[PDB]
Amino acid sequence: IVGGTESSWGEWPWQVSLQVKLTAQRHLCGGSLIGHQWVLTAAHCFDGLPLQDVWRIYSGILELSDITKDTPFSQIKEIIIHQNYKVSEGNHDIALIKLQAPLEYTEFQKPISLPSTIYTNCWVTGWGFSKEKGEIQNILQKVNIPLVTNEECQKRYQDYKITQRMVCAGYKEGGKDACKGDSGGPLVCKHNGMWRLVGITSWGEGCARREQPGVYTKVAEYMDWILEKTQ
């Protein structure tokens, strides 16, 4: 997250960290807990070698440095990458993860409600870079960013097709955005006093540049797919 600040315990209780354990262990992507046994993330998080039994999913965590061998984690039972996703391309950047065991809902880990509206009060969170050529951040970062219309987003990225299945968010003069390592995490907005998952963090040209909004997978346009794959 560029231009954000530190979050607090329980503030974003659906945020998870997707890590890979090889000799060393590292955070690769964010995700959103959507049910006891389901996490939503970005398909591109799985672009690397499809190694077996390396992923560890951490929920109810604030600081990456607090993770040790005794910290509990979830494991992957199944990865469901959207069938039409293609590597190095934007469309359908979405994946479901079924966990090996159901997680309990607590004060510190709870699901984000899925969307069924002009959203105000939208936030993006994660442990990604705080600047374009940066590094993973230790404490979960948060930033408040306005949505832009798809017509405006398309005007900013005339070199790509911004589809109705994407949603964009950014400031005209930049400075606040998601970045590398935030991929797969949530873009949440308020409605009726309740948080809803509006987007999955996907892409931008650079990070936080003026007139270059972040591009997110628009969750509402994947609800039929989510319901089909989870039932």
Ligand SMILES: Cc1nc(N)cc2c1CNC(=O)c1cnn(c1)Cc1ccc(Cn3cccn3)cc1OCCC/C=C/CCO2
């Ligand atoms: C979350 C995030 N935010 C920003 N601002 C930048 C980020 C990021 C982090 N995002 C990634 O690193 C990343 C890797 N693959 N992808 C994203 C998929 C992707 C999505 C969209 C597009 C362009 N497009 C827009 C509409 C249609 N197409 C391209 C994609 O992949 C090509 C390679 C992506 C490289 C990204 C480097 C910078 O990464």
